[PDB]
């Protein structure tokens, strides 16, 4: 029976990988950072309160210019906000009201959304007839589409609940690369600054590092005990943080292939919906189910502040590319800008 | 007032967008949203045809009431990842076939179809997002049940049954066993129908149940009940 032989070989290789990871840890991050200045206390005040959604807000995305927003709600409408003046630029009606993700193109030309409809829809923002149309409807997934990020104006990457991540070509409307290997529903995506790698977060408590132009998994990251709901790279591209339902954030290193730090508190027993780093990589903002967000110290593992003001679950986070503002979306149909 | 002409025009555009958003909000708030479930393929297609990829929606109007129905079939994923999207539905329509107490799912050679339906009903009716959501229970294929009960007793599916092997008592026992799984009796009500009627009577039952649910919701909101 070759099944037992191959299972034993896989288990032995897992032991070898674990031994290599353990022999590579000589000092911990808490043993190096203990002799630096504390972050202090972070008092962030609400400046804007975007109004107009009449249902739960499930996702938002900032623009590259750090001024425009896009928000998706169960009303079945996408709203583009001018954060400086609280103005509404566009109100895009959706054919399916069960939207669960949104994205804004880096060039400011396209807006993508998707959800329970199994379809990723691309919207053309700048047209000669003055309205917003649907450019392509990308079909091919067999489960709810949970995340979508733009590589450029022509390539998009999507994650779905069919244990599969895909890379599309918008012009031809086809799927270029298929990423397989997850044993559970892929929940979160985050793209590298160089737009060459990306990580996935699934319900099997794992994070995998992918190559965009190779379709090959590089490394697998474990350590969580529950479903991973959020993920985001460190700004330089050599680390990332993961959010899960076990009321804990992690920090992983791509070069050491190991877990760096664990963010957890005794009073926190609620799951985490969103994570985001600051511009410098020192503050780790995390959105929790206890209706408020906690600002962490990415190097000292100490809570720095609390952003309260939401009457329901905080669903989506976001930090501007210049680090000026943080935007929080909640199930109470509100967005808030903090500084 | 410290605003350019283009700034004022943008403000006016935003206000028009807000007005359209409101109008859509009050237009969609007077729509009944129903979530249709059911184990396997028992009577879902039949009832959809009676009142005619991923999520499938069917629209129909009955007596100046727009009904918005959702079929979550073929969504072979984790249920606890998208079941909170339907937290605000008016009611849940549940379909159970009476002619599967003698059947096996063919995936597990020992599990009964009726017990699988009961387990799924227990999972849905006691979900924490559906604490105050009423359930409309549809029991299909009563003629098949009547013509199969005389050759096979109900004791094979319910070994504790100690009643007469006739149609009415067995149907009542099945209904009682389904209704006894409700652990939130103080905040939700289960409406039961025997729906093997080719006539246009099932949609009337749905209308009556939705009207009763709306009345109870309004009474609770006002505070009388």
């Amino acid at each position, epitope marked *: 029976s070759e099944l037992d032989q191959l299972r034993q070989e896989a288990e032995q290789l897992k032991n070898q990988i674990r031994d290599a990871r353990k022999a590579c840890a000589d000092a911990t991050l808490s043993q190096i950072t203990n002799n630096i200045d504390p972050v202090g206390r972070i008092q962030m005040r609400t400046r804007r309160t975007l109004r107009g959604h009449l249902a739960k807000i499930y996702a938002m995305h900032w623009g590259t210019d750090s001024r425009l927003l896009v928000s998706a709600s169960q009303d079945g409408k996408l709203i583009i906000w001018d954060s400086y003046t609280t103005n509404k*630029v566009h109100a895009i009606p959706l054919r399916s009201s069960w939207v669960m993700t949104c994205a804004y193109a880096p060039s400011g030309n396209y807006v993508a959304c998707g959800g329970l409809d199994n379809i990723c829809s691309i919207y053309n923002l700048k047209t000669r*007839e003055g*309205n917003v149309r649907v450019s392509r409807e990308l079909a091919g997934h067999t489960g709810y589409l949970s995340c979508c990020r733009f590589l450029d104006d022509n390539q998009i990457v999507t994650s779905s609940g069919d244990t599969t991540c895909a890379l599309w070509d918008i012009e031809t409307g086809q799927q270029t690369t298929t990423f397989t290997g997850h044993t559970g529903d892929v929940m979160s995506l985050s793209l590298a600054p160089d737009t060459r790698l990306f990580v996935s977060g699934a319900c099997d408590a794992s994070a995998k590092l992918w190559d965009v132009r190779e379709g090959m998994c590089r490394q697998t990251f474990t350590g969580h005990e529950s479903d991973i709901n959020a993920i985001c790279f460190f700004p330089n591209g050599n680390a990332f943080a993961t959010g899960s339902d076990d009321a804990t954030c992690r920090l992983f290193d791509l070069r050491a292939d190991q877990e760096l730090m664990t963010y957890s508190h005794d009073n926190i027993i609620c799951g985490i919906t969103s994570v985001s780093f600051s511009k410098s990589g020192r503050l780790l903002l995390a959105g929790y189910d206890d209706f408020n967000c906690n600002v962490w110290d990415a190097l000292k593992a100490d809570r720095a502040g609390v952003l309260a003001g939401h009457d329901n679950r905080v669903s989506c986070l976001g930090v501007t590319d210049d680090g000026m503002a943080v935007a929080t979306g909640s199930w109470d149909s509100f967005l808030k800008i903090w500084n | 007032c*410290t605003l*350019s*002409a*283009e700034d004022k025009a943008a403000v006016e555009r935003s206000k*028009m967008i807000d007005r359209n958003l409101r109008e859509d909000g009050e237009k969609a708030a007077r729509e009944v949203k129903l979530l249709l479930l059911g184990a396997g393929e028992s009577g879902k297609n039949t009832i959809v045809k009676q009142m005619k990829t991923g999520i499938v929606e069917t629209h129909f109007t009955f007596k100046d009431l727009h009904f918005k129905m959702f079929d979550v079939g073929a969504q072979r994923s984790e249920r606890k990842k998208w079941i909170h999207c339907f937290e605000g539905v008016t009611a849940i329509i549940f379909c159970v076939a009476l002619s599967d107490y003698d059947l096996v799912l063919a995936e597990d050679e020992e599990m009964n179809r009726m017990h699988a339906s009961m387990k799924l009903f227990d999972s849905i009716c006691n979900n924490k997002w559906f604490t105050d959501t009423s359930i409309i229970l549809f029991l299909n294929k009563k003629d098949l049940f009547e013509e199969k009960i005389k050759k096979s007793p109900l004791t094979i599916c319910y070994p504790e049954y100690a009643g007469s092997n006739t149609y009415e008592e067995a149907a009542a026992y099945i209904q009682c066993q389904f209704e006894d799984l409700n652990k939130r009796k103080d905040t939700k009500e289960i409406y039961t129908h025997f729906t093997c009627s080719t006539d246009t009577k099932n949609v009337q039952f749905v209308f009556d149940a939705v009207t009763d649910v709306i009345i109870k919701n309004n009474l609770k909101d006002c505070g009388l009940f």
Partner: single-chain antibody
Amino acid sequence: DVQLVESGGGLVQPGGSRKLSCSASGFAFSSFGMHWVRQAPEKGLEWVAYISSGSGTIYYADTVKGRFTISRDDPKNTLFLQMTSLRSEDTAMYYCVRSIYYYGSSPFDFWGQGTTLTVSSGSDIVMTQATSSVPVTPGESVSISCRSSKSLLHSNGNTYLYWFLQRPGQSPQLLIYRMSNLASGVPDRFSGSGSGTAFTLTISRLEAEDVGVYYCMQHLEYPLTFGAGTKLEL
């Protein structure tokens, strides 16, 4: 494609009344604001009226108040200009101009073909283009200067100055919409720069298709004023 065909002109006696119709085909007429710009045979662009989306805001020039009425028909996609008490100074060619307004928009991006109307028998911002005709050889750079009597650098950071080109026997088209931004469909050879009350339009690598008259317009505050126009020759 996008079109705006005007009708209702002709020869009219003084003191009469006429209506000009602007039929819109190819775009969302409800979401676009509309203007009326007239050009007398003396080669000058003069603003007339404006109606916003939803018919909420209506503006007129000081020389047409009480005589001209502007309205729109959204279901029929038509714009009307009701004219009363016409004088000999209303002899011009009237244009229907499309405009939208939001963050990053491009107002005045389309102009209709226009209609000809003939009649027989201040706090406004003033811009001047001191050069009326610049002879030039193809292949060399051209600089066009337009100065303003008031600073256009609003406190929000935007400078509201626009550039237009009118080829012989055609309709004006947009080149630069806020002092630096190229319009959609124009070559990269056109570059605009300036600050305060000094503005320059640079035409690098000039070709024979760029011959025409160039106009500068402000959109800081109503009424919207134009310039006399600099004409490139040869």
